Each structure stands twice: as structure tokens, then as C-alpha cells.
């Protein structure tokens, strides 16, 4: 019904970011990772500045969306990515990872070491955790609690993230002492970047093309001008879930997914509050099925 000449695309105008804004205290928590075992990083002035910048840029992106200036999820992710890159320090060796999509000839692993240790209990006490045994060229056989996150896409049920937590605590202490003595602390740390017994094995990058296409489909639904509030919050939660669980980039995906979900909300005049202390949104996504995440999304938010 309207036409954006700069993006050369027809769109239905949305209200855009709300005039009533979050309090500054909340602005400075947008995008924070408020771990339950340690929320202290989120109190520093550096982190507060990072978060308030995210908030301001989320609102600017919401304005672009409301005017037809961002026309696909991939473009919104690009905005989030360039914003995230701007916060890296001069010289950052991870700059390329923050700037780059993951590729298939790579596996991606998050060892569940600091700051992720609160996740170990969440896996062990998970309703959907299964007991399994994993074979391992350095540790041998290990009892693990495993959560296998899955997704429904066009009737294909695909594996997303797999959490493994090894439960033989004393045997592990023992076997790591052996490994450290035989290999050195840094070299073993290098091996465990991929094979730490406690870890998340991330969504295979081969799924990223179809997930990226699905995110574009969700975005097209989400910029509709005639959605109910429940429909809209459901679409925002689904977009967040898919983008965070896909983990499309070598670094920074959690920040980019939260940026994008909040920008979609802001385009509709919704000013979403911070995630509650203790709720790290990408981790909550990866630890749930999609419909479960949609049904609890509001409760993850601080009101
Ligand atoms: O100075 C910073 C940088 C990042 N983050 C947040 O910490 C999380 C980091 O996860 P992400 O996947 O974005 O980055 P990566 O784990 O690849 O470094 C995200 O919620 C960021 O918004 C933060 O609170 N402060």
C-alpha cells in the first residue's frame, strides 16, 4: 500500500518505536547476559554502555522496519551484525568471526565452562534429558545427560543443538589430570575446545540455508500490519528462537538474534523490557522446543 523508494519495495506502514521509552536502568540491560551464577559483568559501565547502544540501535532498526527500509530478515541480521562489530576493540582477532557466517566444513562447539556453568544443572535436570553413553578418543566411555533440541520445518524434524553433560565427576577429575600431565595445559585446552565432555554441539551449518529462508518467511509474517498482540509476540518469540538456536555466525549470534527480535517488536511500537536476571535468552532458546519457548517468552521478560 505504501512504497519505499530507497529499498524499492512495497510495504504496509507500522507505528514505529514507542514514544514512551524504557527507563535508563532498563535500557542498560538490553542485550545483557545475566547469568544466574554471576550477573556482575552487567553492572560495569562498559556493559551498561554496550546495552544502551543496543537499545538505541534496536529502536533505529524498528523505525527502518516500520518505514519499509529493511525488507528481509537477512538485512535485519546485517544491521545487527554491523552494530555488534562496532563494539569490538581495535585489533580484535575475533573480528572475522563476528563478521562471518558459519560454514559446513566446520563443526561448532561451546564448551560448558565459565561463564556457562549454570547450564550444567539445566541439562541434568531437564525434563527431556536422556541418559546416553558417548565414546571419546581421550576419555573413553562417559555417562552423559543429553538434551537433543529439535525443530519442525515443513514436516522435516531436524536436530538443532545437542547439550552433553558428563556425570562421572570423580572419574573425570582423574582422567583430566592424566590428560594434562601427558599433553600440557594449553594443548589439552585446545583439544577440549572441540571435545570437552561438557559441551553444546551446535546446529549443523548445513541446515543454515533452509533456516535462513524460514527466518525470512517469519519476518514477512511479522511485519504484517493486522496482527493481534498475541500473534505478534508469538512471531517475535519464534524469530528469536530460530535465530538464536540456528547460531548462524561464528560469533555474536546471541546478540544479533536478540537485536533482531527486539527491532521487530519496536517496529510495532512495542518496547519490550530486559530479560529477567538469570534468563540468558539464547540459552533458554537452545534449551527448549519452539512451541515451549513461545509459550514462556513473556515470562522470560522482566514484566
Ligand atoms: O560486552 C558485551 C558483549 C556481549 N554481551 C552479551 O553477551 C552475549 C554473548 O553471546 P553472543 O553469542 O552474542 O557472543 P559470542 O558468545 O559469540 O561471543 C549476548 O547476549 C551479548 O549481547 C554483553 O552483555 N556485553
Residue numbers in the entry: 16 to 318
Question: What text appears in the publication on this structure?
Answer:
AvrB, a type III secretion system effector from the plant pathogen Pseudomonas syringae, is a member of the Fido (Fic, Doc, and AvrB) family that triggers HR in Arabidopsis plants to ward off systemic infection. Our investigations herein reveal the distinct and unexpected activity of AvrB acting as a glycosyltransferase that rhamnosylates residue T166 of Arabidopsis thaliana guardee protein RIN4. By elucidating the crystal structures of AvrB and its substrates across different enzymatic states, we provide an explanation for the specificity of substrates and delineate the step-by-step reaction mechanism executed by AvrB in the process of transferring rhamnose to RIN4. The identified biochemical activity of the avirulence protein AvrB as a rhamnosylator adds to the catalytic versatility of the Fido domain–containing protein superfamily.
Structures of AvrB + RIN4 [similar to a reported structure (19)], AvrB + RIN4 + UDP-rhamnose, AvrB + RIN4T166-Rha + UDP, and AvrBR266A + UDP together contribute to deciphering the catalytic mechanisms of AvrB as a rhamnosyltransferase. All the other four subfamilies of Fido domain–containing proteins use diphosphate nucleotide charged cosubstrates for catalytic reactions, and an ADP molecule could be soaked into the cosubstrate binding pocket of AvrB. Under the condition tested, ADP did not cause an obvious shift in the melting temperature, while UDP caused an obvious shift (~+0.8°C). Thus, UDP appears to be the nucleotide capable of binding to AvrB and may be part of the cosubstrate used by AvrB. AvrBG46D and AvrBY65A both caused a +146-Da mass increase in RIN4; however, coexpression with mutants of potential catalytic residues, AvrBR266A or AvrBD297A, did not induce a mass shift. When RfbA, RfbB, RfbC, and RfbD were coexpressed with WT AvrB, but not the R266A mutant, we observed RIN4 rhamnosylation.
